[PDB]
Design a protein around this ligand. Structure first.
Ligand SMILES: O=C(O)/C=C/c1ccc(O)cc1
Length: 258
């Protein structure tokens, strides 16, 4: 079967549960890739495969091939070698508003395409944004869903605690706007280097999120601009319908500079 026929397997790049990512080479092509090897809910596997295919965009990991073998499934992507956005925040502590703004721009373009194609990711966070002034590529479509335009339903309780929308935590129906909440949380980290909602106790984390209990504490927020904090407030609006859309967030002056 076609992957163990055509490809050699090298060094592990990442690992969740379910999945391992390793560098592979298409031997006859002399071409390196990332292979997401999945260690075989078959419905959810083919969905992530279909969604990865759907999405061709500078800011979205580009699926080269999907291969089904005895016991393993391979989703092969173009190799992006710049590391998680997560790692770069750790190393640099935080981004200049200059660098934060080009970054969240990169992210909003990916989120805008996803939404235009009726895909909601639901697990936006730095670990799932990969670097190539290096452009940011959205990854891990393992939790992604398909919506019809502005439809909102209960699609299930899924994602990363720190990043989860109020609507999802209340078990209210939801859609595209949960990605914009995650973008708010991301943007806030970019600017100062910790999240808006932290707590040892998950239950109290979830109370904060549902209640929008974020501040811009002194001293570190005092020199951050009005335009930046404006975007975070519009992204971190509890009302999903009132929340800034991806398209509206690209036309925001902090992102436009126009
Ligand atoms: O969709 C994913 O989960 C990961 C994709 C991926 C693409 C290129 C890499 O270098 C590493 C991971």
């Amino acid at each position: 079967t076609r992957f163990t026929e055509e490809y050699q397997l090298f060094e592990e790049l990442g690992k969740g549960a379910f999945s391992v990512v390793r560098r592979c080479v298409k031997v006859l092509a002399g071409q390196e890739y990332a292979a997401k090897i999945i260690n075989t809910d078959h419905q959810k596997l083919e969905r992530e495969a279909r969604i990865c295919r759907l999405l061709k965009h500078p800011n979205i990991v580009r699926l080269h091939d999907s291969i089904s073998e005895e016991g393993h499934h391979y989703l092969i992507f173009d190799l992006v070698t710049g590391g998680e956005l997560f790692e770069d925040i750790v190393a640099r502590e935080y981004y200049s508003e200059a660098d934060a703004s080009h970054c969240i721009q990169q992210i909003l373009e990916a989120v805008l395409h996803c939404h235009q194609m009726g895909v909601v990711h639901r697990n936006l966070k730095p670990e799932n944004l990969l670097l190539a002034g290096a452009a940011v590529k959205l990854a891990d479509f393992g939790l992604a869903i398909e919506v019809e335009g502005e439809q909102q339903a209960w699609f299930g309780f899924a994602g990363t605690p720190g990043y989860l929308s109020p609507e999802v935590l209340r078990k209210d129906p939801y859609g595209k706007p949960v990605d914009l909440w995650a973008c708010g949380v991301i943007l806030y980290i970019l600017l100062v280097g910790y999240p808006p909602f932290w707590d040892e106790d998950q239950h109290r984390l979830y109370k904060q999120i549902k209640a929008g209990a974020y501040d811009f504490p002194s001293p570190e927020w005092d020199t951050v601009t009005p335009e930046a904090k404006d975007l975070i407030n519009k992204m971190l609006t509890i009302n999903p319908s009132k929340r800034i859309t991806a398209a509206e967030a690209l036309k925001h002056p902090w992102i436009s500079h126009r």
